[PDB]
Amino acid sequence: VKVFDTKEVQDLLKAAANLNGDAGNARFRQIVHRLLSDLFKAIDDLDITPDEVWAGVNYLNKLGQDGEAALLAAGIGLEKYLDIRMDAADRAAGLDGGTPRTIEGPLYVAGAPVRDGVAKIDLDDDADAGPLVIRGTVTGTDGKPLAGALVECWHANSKGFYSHFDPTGAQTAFNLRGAVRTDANGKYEFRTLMPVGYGCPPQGATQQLLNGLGRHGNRPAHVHFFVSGDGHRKLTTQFNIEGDPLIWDDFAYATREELIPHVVDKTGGAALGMKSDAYKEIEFDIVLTPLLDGRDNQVVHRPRASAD
Amino acid sequence: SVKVFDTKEVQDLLKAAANLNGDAGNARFRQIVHRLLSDLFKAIDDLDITPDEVWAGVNYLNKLGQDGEAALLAAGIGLEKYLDIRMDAADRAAGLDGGTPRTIEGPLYVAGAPVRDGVAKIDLDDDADAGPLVIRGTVTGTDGKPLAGALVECWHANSKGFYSHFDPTGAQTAFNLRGAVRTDANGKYEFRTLMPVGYGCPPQGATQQLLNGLGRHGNRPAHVHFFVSGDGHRKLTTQFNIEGDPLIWDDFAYATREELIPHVVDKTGGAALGMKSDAYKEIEFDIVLTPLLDGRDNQVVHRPRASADA
């Protein structure tokens, strides 16, 4: 049967969204009416059964009980889609030359201590991860180095786990998480260990949905960044570790070809405080976009974990 | 505002995310996911929904599930009623619209209540503020003949608006105000209970947070829930509302039906029936069940339901 176009259904949608209500949050009512209307039409069009609907309702309970709604947002492409719309806006405005954005993901932790120029961020021993230096120069789109810019990174350990989100046991606070203010020449450096990519929690709601679609829930090895500086927009980006077999099969659709730097083998590690003489080095330079009339039209406010 | 939805990049992303071009799998599930995601992406594009707005919605979904309230929200934004509208329309088209009208189940059924023959007393806990109530009727098929041994199940709230197994102020006795009766040889059932009071959504929970955002209340009028089943017939999900409740036509779950507001009668003689006062109220609520078409019930609903041991 098809009922969506009937007066009874359209009146129910108007009442459920309180479109005819006293002055209120008009924007919220507009969004709720649109999403509810679309859901009702999809149920009608695809003949979605009550059993199927209640299975979707039950899934929403599990999704939130697991705390995984933002992980699902990445896994079904919604987080990438937000980047697509931001990129389209920048393109229409004539912007080029900045380091490409990519997704934040759900695992930022606020409050990491800020160091000048260089930070050692591996606080916990990890025998299976080799030492890694990440270094680079931050500039603006005019090519000039940005001094005092804030470069933040976070990444996983050799088991694919992040501090504050490790199910096998608590890591030291801010393990593999750090913030550096660039030096006078725009330079930043992190001394860390090499990340390994991971999968979604195997019994969690995100992987349950992915299993139902026939999809894996894995990401290639990567390092996250936030980069900010006076006169410039905040950049959310990442880089992928070259050579990872999942680099073009990320379940969160986040890989970009300009964000895959070369990995160089180096010696002299002990004088840098690394745990072995031989280590890997990645040079990741970063270009920030200036503000427009003092405004950052793309910084994102969302719930984020914190720690002391 | 940009418009990207109808670009190859976005359509390719939707196909990958729902795995449309994947190896053999659950095509139906992939079809539903692709449709829901596509509509969501189009709505974000059409209404210029900002990342901050999207992450607030994602955060709400986390709170909804953490509260265990997705089924309460399904009732509150009309989705549960909408499923009834579609079932009613299918019944009308098939000629299976001759029985007592359906209405929503709601999320508070509990399996395992004790069953009695003919008559059941289901108020196990005292409730000084609720007066005694007899609910009785006859179960027939659409041809009018009584159905013997049909199962009539009842559940409802106490005077504070709380159900057993879902009372936040303290545990009720298992299956307080929950019972089942097997009809007698002439189709009769009777419940002896206490009068329910209507209630509201948990005030701090996700459902009321969203309703507050819309400017709506989260209250229901007083009512009694029923399942009725019997061999050879479809399972009926229905309710009745208590006459005179001011919320009767302003139910936050849109479940009231004019056919399901029975006359309440004042009676005396309660003590002889095991009621706590001489005066009591009686509601007659007859049930007409539809015979199975082709031996199968194609409107019965399987959903997660609580259960308990008596």
Ligand SMILES: O=C1CC(Cl)=C(Cl)C[C@H]1O
């Ligand atoms: O750190 C990460 C963990 C998860 Cl689940 C996503 Cl979705 C992104 C990735 O960067």
Ligand SMILES: O=C1CC(Cl)=C(Cl)C[C@H]1O
């Ligand atoms: O028992 C009830 C409680 C809630 Cl929340 C709904 Cl939605 C329906 C009503 O029958």
Ligand SMILES: [Ca+2]
């Ligand atoms: Ca340029």
Ligand SMILES: [Ca+2]
């Ligand atoms: Ca240490």
Ligand SMILES: [Ca+2]
């Ligand atoms: Ca450990």
Ligand SMILES: [Ca+2]
């Ligand atoms: Ca549409």
Ligand SMILES: [Ca+2]
């Ligand atoms: Ca008693």
Ligand SMILES: [Ca+2]
């Ligand atoms: Ca007794």
Ligand SMILES: [Fe+3]
């Ligand atoms: Fe990550």
Ligand SMILES: [Fe+3]
């Ligand atoms: Fe109820």
